[PDB]
Design a protein around this ligand. Structure first.
Ligand SMILES: OC[C@H]1O[C@H](O)[C@H](O)[C@@H](O)[C@@H]1O
Length: 578
């Protein structure tokens, strides 16, 4: 009995939370009460199966159990609809139908959070319900969230409410903490979102390589066989999580932590404190842990990978292990290299041996492989230093606007809200990365940009509009950033006529958070660039300043939104001209 097994290992509290997540990610439109009903029914059934593994139905697949349980609700169509596709299917075509229907941008209310007293009132009232509702809302808005890590979020959320609904000042306590969690939430969601796209669109060989690269950077004293074994396990975990199998994913993640913590000596000397932690922190910790120190004596690659004969024989005899090995060996030596870079290098090596070992003088044409690495290392470095340079003059917000123009120019067809979200997360690289010394700049930055471009890739995927986005997103995961880089303003694109709509604002702008005000400015800038990509000196900065000044005047005009509408016909015309 699999469900009974997943009960025992996980315990009831984590069991229930995981189950709930699974339902809200499968059916994001569904109200809270229905999923709760479904969870308790599943827990109730699972308990009997721990009571007797021969009890009727306990032998069935988690998929069948969850699917059946789901279909008692999904079939109601003019309310749901296309999940009544899936309900008329049988396993395993149904599970895939559920997965294939995940929505990275579902038309759901953005959650405004109410005032603190009320929130604290809700927590003390029934704190189990409050937590469940927290999971419910995040999971359905992020159907690919690293489900085990979402438990950890819930844990810290609960700790914020337990502490903060006790002090002198509720809001001063809690609101900062909820913000730090909303910040990490977004990043964590996007991090996992890329892992699932590696697996789903490029297959496990691609993921495995990514893994070897990254774990070798992290665990460089560890031998290749130890790395391979962690890599097999890490992949099994993510493969399960990206596929909706949350239960096994949590269970296999705990096991992976047990394993790692018992073998610290073969692995890294930084695990000390992660391994002292409780179950959830423990995994979270490991995943976040800084690189171990490099083995001080390390021999040059050349001996076994260029100078040697048997290069071609090893290549052919065992290509996957030989290539893993190159990548491990080169990875452990360059924690100052982004993972996308190192996989780029390793693809370059392969292709070279490919063509070279097609024997005329193999030992010759592949003698200068490392020669091809030169340009590949330099392209990122220059862009990183340069964009960090541009950021220092500008700061985060002004750095965001520059990107906004850059990428809207690049791919003008992409929805406005998408551009704004993407460019702002793109600008957030400067804050996270340029702070660092060059030792840490490139991984930080180019790896971060993978995450953010992958966001643009999936958001755009839902309703495709620009052939250059689709092309860069399909082409090759490893190449995505360069692909977007090499792109320049679009000639094909027929500039947008013009809207009075899109440049008249309303008096609600005078009371918005600095955050929301930025987003509104940016939204208008995109729309601007969309109207005039070809032409765009400083003439954009003139227009944006003409907007900001009408906004200064109109927010101090104190009337009933009148100059927003009066000066709102005035200036719409004026900006097409200037
Ligand atoms: O991909 C994230 C993972 O990284 C770590 O190496 C551990 O494998 C795991 O517990 C964590 O989830």
């Amino acid at each position: 009995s699999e469900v009974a097994h997943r009960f025992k290992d996980l315990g009831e509290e984590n069991f229930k939370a995981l189950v709930l997540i699974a339902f809200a990610q499968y059916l994001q439109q569904c109200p809270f009460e229905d999923h709760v009903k479904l969870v308790n029914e599943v827990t109730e059934f699972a308990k009997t199966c721990v009571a007797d593994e021969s009890a009727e139905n306990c032998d069935k697949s988690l998929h069948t159990l969850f699917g059946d349980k789901l279909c008692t609700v999904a079939t109601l169509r003019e309310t749901y609809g296309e999940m009544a596709d899936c309900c008329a299917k049988q396993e395993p075509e149904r599970n895939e139908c559920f997965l294939q229907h995940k929505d990275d941008n579902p038309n759901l209310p953005r959650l405004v959070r109410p005032e603190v007293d009320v929130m604290c009132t809700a927590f003390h009232d029934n704190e189990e319900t409050f937590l469940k509702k927290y999971l419910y809302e995040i999971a359905r808005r992020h159907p690919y969230f690293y489900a085990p890590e979402l438990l950890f979020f819930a844990k810290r959320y609960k700790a914020a409410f337990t502490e903060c609904c006790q002090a002198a000042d509720k809001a001063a306590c809690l609101l900062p903490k909820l913000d730090e969690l909303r910040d990490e939430g977004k990043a964590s969601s996007a991090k996992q979102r890329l892992k699932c796209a590696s697996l789903q669109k490029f297959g496990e060989r691609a993921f495995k390589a990514w893994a070897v690269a990254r774990l070798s950077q992290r665990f460089p004293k560890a031998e290749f066989a130890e790395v391979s074994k962690l890599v097999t396990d890490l992949t099994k975990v993510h493969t399960e999580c990206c596929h909706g199998d949350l239960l096994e994913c949590a269970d296999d993640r705990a096991d992976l932590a047990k394993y790692i913590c018992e073998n610290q000596d073969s692995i890294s000397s930084k695990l000390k404190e992660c391994c002292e932690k409780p179950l959830l922190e423990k995994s979270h910790c490991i995943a976040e842990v800084e690189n171990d120190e490099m083995p001080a004596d390390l021999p040059s690659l050349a001996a076994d990978f260029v100078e040697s004969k048997d290069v071609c024989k090893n290549y052919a005899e065992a290509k996957d292990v030989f290539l893993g090995m190159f990548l491990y060996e080169y990875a452990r030596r360059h924690p100052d290299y982004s993972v996308v870079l190192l996989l780029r290098l390793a693809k370059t090596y392969e292709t070279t041996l490919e063509k070279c070992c097609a024997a005329a003088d193999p030992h010759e044409c592949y003698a200068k492989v490392f020669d091809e690495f030169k340009p590949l290392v330099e392209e990122p470095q220059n862009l990183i230093k340069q964009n960090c340079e541009l950021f220092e003059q500008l700061g985060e917000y002004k750095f965001q606007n520059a990107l906004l123009v850059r990428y809207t120019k690049k791919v003008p067809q992409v929805s406005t809200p998408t551009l704004v979200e993407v460019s702002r997360n793109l600008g957030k690289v400067g804050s996270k990365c340029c702070k660092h010394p060059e030792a840490k700049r490139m991984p930080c930055a180019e790896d971060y940009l993978s995450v953010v471009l992958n966001q643009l890739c999936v958001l755009h995927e839902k309703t495709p509009v620009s052939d250059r986005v689709t092309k860069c997103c399909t082409e090759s995961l490893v190449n995505r950033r360069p692909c977007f880089s090499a792109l320049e303003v679009d000639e094909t694109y027929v500039p947008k006529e013009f809207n009075a709509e899109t440049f008249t604002f309303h008096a609600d702008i005078c009371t918005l958070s600095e955050k929301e005000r930025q987003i509104k400015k940016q939204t208008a800038l995109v729309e601007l660039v969309k109207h005039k990509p070809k032409a765009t000196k400083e003439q954009l900065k003139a227009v944006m300043d003409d907007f900001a000044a009408f906004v200064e005047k109109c927010c101090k005009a104190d009337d009933k939104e009148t100059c927003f509408a009066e000066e709102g016909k005035k200036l719409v015309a004026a900006s097409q001209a200037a």
